[PDB]
């Protein structure tokens, strides 16, 4: 399970 705060954009 990676970081949920990772870049959520394209």
């Amino acid at each position, epitope marked *: 399970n990676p*970081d*949920p*705060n*990772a*870049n*959520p*954009n*394209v």
Partner: antibody
Amino acid sequence: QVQLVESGGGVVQPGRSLRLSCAASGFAFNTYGMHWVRQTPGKGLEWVAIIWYDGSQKYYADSVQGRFIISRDNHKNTLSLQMNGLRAEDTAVYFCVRVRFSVGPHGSAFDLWGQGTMVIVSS
Amino acid sequence: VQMTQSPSTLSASVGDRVTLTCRASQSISSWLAWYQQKPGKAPKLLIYDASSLESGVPSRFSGSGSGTEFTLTISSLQPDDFATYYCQQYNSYSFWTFGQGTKVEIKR
């Protein structure tokens, strides 16, 4: 210009379901990650859920984990939040929030907020 | 992370220099955001990355700090600045948490 408009709020019986909507305009909806952040004057703001731009990764707060279902429609540029088993503490002004367009591995702040929709959970 | 903002409410006047202190229970590096919310209105982003100004925000708003201690500074207060300011963390697996907010009101 860029704006967000919420809809679908109202008074809901406890334990029932209520789905909130968010209409997007001006910006490319499919290229942004969205959020739901509610707020009550007694406790301040509270993050609810986030959905990825492609809808891959979805996360929820512990207080709403398993009861809320976040989803988006890149075709119609709409962000929706299915709320199930609504308790009285769910009563808050729900905002659909857009993250700031960041380049890198990490997300950004909240650069876009809607006017907010009011839901009142009471029997 | 638990964001604690002190004081809960602060009185000020027009032209004063306002420094609002935001504390995080854990260390969030510089992934902190500042907001301004008028009563009945949507929150308005002011500063992201705890030191970077947002487009459209006047230069009087400045932010600094890293780790656990952060500060929002207003060089000269303005009549349209009386609102409630929130600080929020978005670092690492710690998802997204706001403080209780600091309300800046007019004296007397």
